[PDB]
Amino acid sequence: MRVGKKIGCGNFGELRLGKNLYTNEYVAIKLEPIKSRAPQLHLEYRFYKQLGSAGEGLPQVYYFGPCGKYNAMVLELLGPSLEDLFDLCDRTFTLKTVLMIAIQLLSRMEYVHSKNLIYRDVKPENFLIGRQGNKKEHVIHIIDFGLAKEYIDPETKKHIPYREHKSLGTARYMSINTHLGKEQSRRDDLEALGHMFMYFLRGSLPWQGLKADTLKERYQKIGDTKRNTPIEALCENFPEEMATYLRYVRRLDFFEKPDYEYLRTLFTDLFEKKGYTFDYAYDWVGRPIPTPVGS
Ligand SMILES: CC(C)n1cnc2/c(=N/c3cccc(Cl)c3)nc(NCCO)[nH]c21
Numbered sequence: 237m238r239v240g241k242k243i244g245c246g247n248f249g250e251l252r253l254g255k256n257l258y259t260n261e262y263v264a265i266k267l268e269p270i271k272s273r274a275p276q277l278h279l280e281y282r283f284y285k286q287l288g289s290a291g292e293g294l295p296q297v298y299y300f301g302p303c304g305k306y307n308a309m310v311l312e313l314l315g316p317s318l319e320d321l322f323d324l325c326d327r328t329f330t331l332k333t334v335l336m337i338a339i340q341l342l343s344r345m346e347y348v349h350s351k352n353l354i355y356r357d358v359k360p361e362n363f364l365i366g367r368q369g370n371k372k373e374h375v376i377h378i379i380d381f382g383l384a385k386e387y388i389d390p391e392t393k394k395h396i397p398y399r400e401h402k403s404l405g406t407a408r409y410m411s412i413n414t415h416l417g418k419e420q421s422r423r424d425d426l427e428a429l430g431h432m433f434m435y436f437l438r439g440s441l442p443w444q445g446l447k448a449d450t451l452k453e454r455y456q457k458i459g460d461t462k463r464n465t466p467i468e469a470l471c472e473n474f475p476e477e478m479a480t481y482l483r484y485v486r487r488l489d490f491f492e493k494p495d496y497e498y499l500r501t502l503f504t505d506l507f508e509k510k511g512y513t514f515d516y517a518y519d520w521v522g523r524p525i526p527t528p529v530g531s
């Protein structure tokens with residue numbers, strides 16, 4: 237409605253509706269308290285700037301600066317997330333929808349990697365369609381670069397070294413090697429995507445809803461269960477290509493450049509085999525799509 241409206245409640249701050257005075261267009265204002273003892277917003281801004289707004293499926297970024305008691309980052313206003321659309325579609329997606337998502341997100345993640353960044357926060361909440369009117373509703377955008385990292389050193393142009401005993405993104409989708417505390421690299425982004433694709437097809441993953449003693453133990457139980465769930469069991473009654481995908485990405489080496497084209501062709505060949513047309517008729521098309529604003 238009017239600018240200044242709260243349009244999102246984030247983990248580190250909030251999201252408000254703004255206007256671009258140059259165009260009269262609505263924009264998104266991401267806010268983080270200046271008092272934050274774990275500031276993330278400026279890091280994110282710097283990453284967005286390294287990516288640029290050239291490659292498709294990245295929000296345009298306009299501004300970073302202090303705004304009252306907040307730091308403010310202003311960027312392109314988008315539509316709902318894949319998780320919201322998953323909820324709208326009663327928490328399963330068709331194969332056709334999942335393949336259209338997968339093919340696009342493989343290009344998106346490749347682009348991110350091409351800019352020397354690893355993403356490290358794959359989850360459905362972080363992939364948003366464009367707004368309805370704005371003719372980019374078919375485009376799946378990647379957002380939230382707060383957990384990202386430069387994996388090629390700017391100075392030496394060398395890949396970051398291998399390391400262990402690391403922190404611990406989001407437990408539901410993270411790679412097995414992330415659970416083991418290994419430094420994440422390009423492979424881990426692709427494995428998390430694969431877990432997300434299987435989440436969409438199945439409706440859930442078998443390491444969801446586990447009970448723990450503490451956060452530490454839940455991460456442990458989830459990681460243990462991922463290892464104990466064979467890909468064959470995980471992908472039972474879905475096309476073999478899903479299992480082929482998971483095997484490939486699980487078997488990538490730390491420094492290895494993924495063959496993104498191989499993975500996209502795996503899904504495109506299945507897409508053609510099934511007789512599907514890439515018409516952007518996702519499952520949610522024809523349903524009432526949430527919109528952040530009208531005008
Ligand atoms: C690039 C980031 C800062 N960005 C841009 N647009 C959005 C966004 N748009 C909304 C917000 C509320 C409802 C809807 Cl349908 C879209 N939501 C979110 N997050 C969900 C908060 O409601 N992030 C957005």
Ligand SMILES: CC(C)n1cnc2/c(=N/c3cccc(Cl)c3)nc(NCCO)[nH]c21
Binds near residue numbers: 257
């Ligand atoms: C009335 C308030 C809620 N409002 C409305 N629109 C904006 C706003 N819009 C911007 C700021 C920078 C670039 C662009 Cl394109 C829009 N920014 C801000 N704050 C960031 C710049 O001070 N506030 C805005």
Ligand SMILES: CC(C)n1cnc2/c(=N/c3cccc(Cl)c3)nc(NCCO)[nH]c21
Binds near residue numbers: 239254255256258299
């Ligand atoms: C691209 C830049 C010049 N730009 C475009 N629109 C804005 C902007 N929009 C506002 C701010 C306050 C109220 C309203 Cl309605 C819009 N604010 C700001 N504030 C930050 C200083 O420019 N910048 C804006």
